[PDB]
Design a protein around this nucleic acid. Structure first.
Lengths: 273, 312
DNA sequence: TGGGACTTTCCT
DNA sequence: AAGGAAAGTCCC
């Protein structure tokens, strides 16, 4: 009888683990999560509060949100989906025991083929759509949450997808980081070669973005200048003022065309002449 | 009567094994003398000529107790990993062209190993000099198929159980065996096998060839302690070092090492380090010295790259 | 032939 | 158990 996620799952940062992969290793981090305080996904059933069942499941990112292949093993989690009674004394019920078992392409047909043969489908999406190409680096959480009625019957409440979640391993779903650079400054004239050590990046799809108020440009460099996708050797871009006169600390960050994603910011002081 | 001669062994490093998945041709196991603008292959040779002869070669293991390695030496005359070459007459020197090593998985080791021991024991290949010391009669016997009975199977299979446990899938060794004709005209005379040196998979993170691809700067002050970025080929985080050295006339000593930590090797492909003090910080004219990637392990080294020290 | 990068695993 | 690297795989 109504519901809305209080703590939206993590965005682009977590990493999809496997079966063989460390089991019981980790869990599912929440919105405002932290390196010192976690906080898992919790859904608040405003108003109504009492006994209720819960079946959490993972679904694709786009429009027809079909059930996603990846399991979600952990406490009580079955066949892939999640299921367990909800505290029949409190409302907003949390979930600290969820793991995302990403599957191999190998066993995919089977994986989704389980979703059906095991009835899994928070949006009763047609079975003819329950197949074909699926994206394995992006998923959403759904809450097929059921409770009682004004009296005492099985009043099922409408599902709701949790913000996107992305595989960190996928080199184009991963978090674009800037680990360290040699130079930290340069001339407004631009052209100061720089060595940027960074996290796995895809040369075909990556850029070095220089922001700064009223100024926008990118470092010149070719693909051959991206070493084992973990280092780039670009040349600093000409600042707006060909005759600056003082430190104008601007910002430098890695950018991914496709995703349109921007790495954290790093300062690059533009000195004069 | 005679013997074999490893004439020209294999390059020993730089070769990358391949899994069945890689399929197509991917080269030929190099000679220890191949140098691009001239390439060779492990060549063998006999001495006391025996007209015609058959020399089979199989991959053995680099352990104190030479055994059969799971990897399969796939090539031309090869089949099940026993490339058989018919040493031409008069010319007792037949080389082995583009061989190529096949990499078994860690799961297919005992599985693939059974066959290797099964075979040979059949085809008459090397007398339990690799399998066990209870056979030795896996040569010819006389005639038949040598099914060694369903009994003997227990030693082979169980031999494939204690070897598969220590087997190292990263290194192999050739095992050249020569067979000279007999009365029947067949080749039954086993000439003492001669194992090769030792070939190291290049795919392995510590057997690959070291190379310095890029350095943001190739000059520093004799004082040293000037940061530098070196982009490299996969190097093992805690087993690599930067060596600066010089050809000193009065002998040829002096060597320096960059100062960095494993925590300064960016994802096995980059190294950020500080430069070492040069010998003569009293220099007035800069001096050209060298830099070189070196593996603390085997001490293998990259082609040295120039570095110029200038005074303070 | 010669070689990068991707996918799945294993070791912390 | 969040992250680094080795092992196994595709596709130039």
């Amino acid at each position: 009888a109504y519901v809305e996620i209080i703590e939206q799952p993590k965005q682009r940062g977590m990493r999809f683990r496997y079966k063989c992969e460390g089991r019981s290793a980790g869990s599912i981090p929440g919105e405002r999560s932290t390196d010192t305080t976690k906080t898992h996904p919790t859904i608040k059933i405003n108003g109504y509060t009492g006994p209720g069942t819960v079946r959490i499941s993972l679904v694709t990112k786009d429009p027809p949100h079909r059930p996603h292949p990846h399991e979600l093993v952990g406490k009580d989690c079955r066949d892939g989906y999640y299921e367990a009674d909800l505290c029949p004394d409190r409302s907003i019920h949390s979930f600290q025991n969820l793991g995302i078992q990403c599957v191999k392409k190998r066993d995919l047909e089977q994986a989704i083929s389980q979703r059906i043969q095991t009835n899994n489908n928070p949006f009763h999406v047609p079975i003819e759509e329950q197949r074909g190409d699926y994206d394995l680096n992006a998923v959403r959480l759904c809450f097929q949450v059921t409770v009682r009625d004004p009296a005492g019957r099985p009043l099922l409440l409408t599902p709701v997808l949790s913000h996107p979640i992305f595989d960190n391993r996928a080199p184009n779903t991963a978090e674009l980081k800037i680990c360290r650079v040699n130079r930290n400054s340069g001339s407004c004239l631009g052209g100061d070669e720089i060595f940027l050590l960074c996290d796995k990046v895809q040369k075909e799809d990556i850029e070095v973005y220089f922001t700064g108020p009223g100024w926008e440009a990118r470092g010149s460099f070719s693909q051959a200048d991206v070493h084992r996708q973990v280092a780039i050797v670009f040349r600093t871009p000409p600042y707006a003022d060909p005759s600056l006169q003082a430190p104008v600390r601007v910002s430098m960050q890695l950018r991914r065309p496709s995703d349109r994603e921007l790495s954290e910011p790093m300062e690059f002081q533009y000195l004069p002449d | 009567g005679p013997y074999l001669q490893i004439l020209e062994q294999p390059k020993q490093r730089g070769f990358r094994f391949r899994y069945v998945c890689e399929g197509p041709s991917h080269g030929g196991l190099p000679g220890a003398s191949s140098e691009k603008n001239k390439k060779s292959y492990p060549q063998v040779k006999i001495c006391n000529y025996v007209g015609p002869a058959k020399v089979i070669v199989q991959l053995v293991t680099n352990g104190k107790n030479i055994h059969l390695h799971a990897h399969s030496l796939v090539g031309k005359h090869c089949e099940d990993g026993v490339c058989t070459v018919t040493a031409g007459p008069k010319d007792m020197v037949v080389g082995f062209a583009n061989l190529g090593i096949l990499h078994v998985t860690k799961k297919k080791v005992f599985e693939t190993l059974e066959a290797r021991m099964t075979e040979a024991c059949i085809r008459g290949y090397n007398p339990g000099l690799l399998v066990h010391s209870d056979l030795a009669y896996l040569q010819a016997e006389g005639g038949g198929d040598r099914q060694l009975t369903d009994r003997e199977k227990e030693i082979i299979r169980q031999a494939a159980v204690q070897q598969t446990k220590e087997m190292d899938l990263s290194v192999v060794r050739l095992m050249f065996t020569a067979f000279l004709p007999d009365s029947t005209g067949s080749f039954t005379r086993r000439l003492e096998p001669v194992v090769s040196d030792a070939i190291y998979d290049s795919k392995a993170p510590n057997a690959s060839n070291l190379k310095i691809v890029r350095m943001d700067r190739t000059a520093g002050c004799v004082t040293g302690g000037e940061e530098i970025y070196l982009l490299c080929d996969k190097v093992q985080k805690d087993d690599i070092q930067i060596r600066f050295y010089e050809e000193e006339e009065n002998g040829g000593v002096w060597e320096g090492f960059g100062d960095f930590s494993p925590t300064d090797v960016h994802r096995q492909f980059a190294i950020v380090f500080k430069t070492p003090k040069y010998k003569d910080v009293n220099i007035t004219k800069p001096a050209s010295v060298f830099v070189q990637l070196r593996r603390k392990s085997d001490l293998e080294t990259s082609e040295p790259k120039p570095f110029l020290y200038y005074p303070e």
